[PDB]
Amino acid sequence: QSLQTYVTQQLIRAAEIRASANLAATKMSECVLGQSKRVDFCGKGYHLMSFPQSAPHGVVFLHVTYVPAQEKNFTTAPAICHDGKAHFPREGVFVSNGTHWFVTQRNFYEPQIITTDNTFVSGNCDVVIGIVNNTVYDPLQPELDS
Amino acid sequence: QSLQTYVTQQLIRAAEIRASANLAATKMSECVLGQSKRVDFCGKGYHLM
Amino acid sequence: NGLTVLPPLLTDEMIAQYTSALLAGTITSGWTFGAGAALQIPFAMQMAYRFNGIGVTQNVLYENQKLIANQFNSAIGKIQDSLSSTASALGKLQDVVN
Ligand SMILES: *[C@@H]1O[C@H](CO)[C@@H](O[C@@H]2O[C@H](CO)[C@@H](O)[C@H](O)[C@H]2NC(C)=O)[C@H](O)[C@H]1NC(C)=O
Ligand SMILES: *[C@@H]1O[C@H](CO)[C@@H](O[C@@H]2O[C@H](CO)[C@@H](O)[C@H](O)[C@H]2NC(C)=O)[C@H](O)[C@H]1NC(C)=O
Ligand SMILES: *[C@@H]1O[C@H](CO)[C@@H](O)[C@H](O)[C@H]1NC(C)=O
Ligand SMILES: *[C@@H]1O[C@H](CO)[C@@H](O)[C@H](O)[C@H]1NC(C)=O
Known part of the structure; x- marks a missing residue:
């Protein structure tokens, strides 16, 4: 009865270790090989890469992650009115430093002048809840005008 | 006691088959339906279907 | 007969304060409170990111925002009607208690 008690609790504990070995094998595939x-x-933050280090009866993953920092508050818009057109960012968001408008990527502040290259049109000024008027620079225009 | 030994080992083995059916249900949703x-x-390599 | 029931560490009020924080994070900041500090973002713009994450171009949300908002509000309405009428919805938790 003492040996049956030990084998039963080792069988239930082997199932806990095997669930953890399946998890470790999956972190190996997805975090390390990918x-x-x-x-x-x-790990916490946006994952970059992970390095496995062995340990007694285990594995240790050194999960490298990008964690964002140093927020600035900006005024923002869903879309920009131009010549009737509503423009949306191809990637990123519209942001404003009070007086001027830029498009930036979402996860790092890199303000670009708003243009027909970094924005796409869809419909017109009437539809969108909270569209904000601002010029959209067309990069071809000076190349013809000069 | 030999019945309790059998039913105990079958309850534990059912939990191993259920972990494999939860995995096979997950493979069905993510690999086949996606x-x-x-x-x-x-599988190894970049997954297609 | 020697049976005792120990209390949980978190009270159900503490559990509800964690679900409050997960809601209020998700609504005011999107996924960003998982990645670091909660970066505020307007909920319609967060929803437009979430549309771009299913491969539907974000203008499809802004041009349909009233419809998408009504479909969300109305679907949350039908969750209440389901749970209020149908106790066997909780069948997994009630089965564990049983
Ligand atoms: C918002 O950003 C714009 C562009 O970076 C700023 O405008 C420039 O400001 C400097 C300093 O006053 C001037 O030398 C430049 O000539 C300005 N450029 C333009 C195109 O006008 C603007 O000052 C910023 N505003 C705030 C409140 O931060
Ligand atoms: C953005 O520009 C539009 C158009 O310039 C402004 O809305 C009105 O547009 C008509 C022409 O379509 C004009 O006759 C009106 O004078 C405009 N109204 C106003 C109050 O200017 C729109 O108002 C501008 N942006 C804002 C403030 O929403
Ligand atoms: C953003 O603005 C609010 C006031 O509107 C302020 O309390 C908050 O600290 C600001 N956050 C940052 C990161 O500047
Ligand atoms: C934000 O709310 C104000 C009123 O509080 C409204 O005038 C404005 O159009 C709204 N802007 C956006 C982007 O929804």
Whole structure:
């Protein structure tokens, strides 16, 4: 009865270790051999890469992650009115430093002048809740005018 | 006691088969019904289908 | 007969304060409170990112915002009607208690 009690609890504990070995084998595949889009799977922050180090009866993953910092508050808009057109960013967001408008990428502040190259049109000024008027620079125009 | 030994080992073994059915249900959703970006989940190489 | 029931560490009020924080993070800041500090973003612009994440171009949300908002509000309405009428919706939790 003492040996049956020990084997039963070793069988239940082997199932806990095997669930953890399946998890470790999956972090190996997805975090180490790949880059993971799964939030908080390969550590807190946006995952960059992971390095396995062995340990007694285990594995240790050194999860390298990009963590964003030093926020600035900006005024923002869903779309920009130009000559009737509503313009949306191809990637990024519209942001304003009070007096001027830029498009920046979402995860780092890199303000670009708003143009027909970094924005796309869809419909017109009437439809969008909270569209904000601002010029959209067309990069071809000076190349004809000069 | 030999019945309790059998039913105990079958309850534990059922939990191993259920972990494999939860995995096979997940492979069905992510590999078959989709295309998976998860490395080595749907076989080695970049998954197509 | 020697049976005892120990309390949980978090009270159900503490659990509800965590679900409050996860809601209020998700609504005011999108996924960004998982990645670091909660970066505020307007909920319609967060929803336009979430559209771009399913491969639907974000203008499809802004041009349909009233419809998408009504479909969300109305679907949350039908969750209440389901749960209020149908106790066997909780069948997994009630089965564990049983
Ligand atoms: C918002 O950003 C713009 C562009 O970076 C700033 O405008 C420039 O400001 C400097 C300093 O006053 C001037 O030398 C430049 O000639 C300005 N450029 C233009 C195109 O006008 C603007 O000052 C910023 N505003 C705020 C409140 O930060
Ligand atoms: C952005 O520009 C539009 C058009 O210039 C402004 O809306 C009105 O547009 C008509 C022409 O379509 C004009 O006759 C009106 O004078 C404009 N109204 C106003 C109050 O200017 C729109 O108002 C501008 N942006 C804002 C402030 O929403
Ligand atoms: C953003 O603005 C609010 C006031 O409107 C302020 O309390 C907050 O600290 C600001 N955040 C940053 C990162 O500047
Ligand atoms: C924000 O709310 C104000 C009123 O509080 C409204 O005039 C404005 O159009 C709104 N802007 C956006 C981007 O929704």
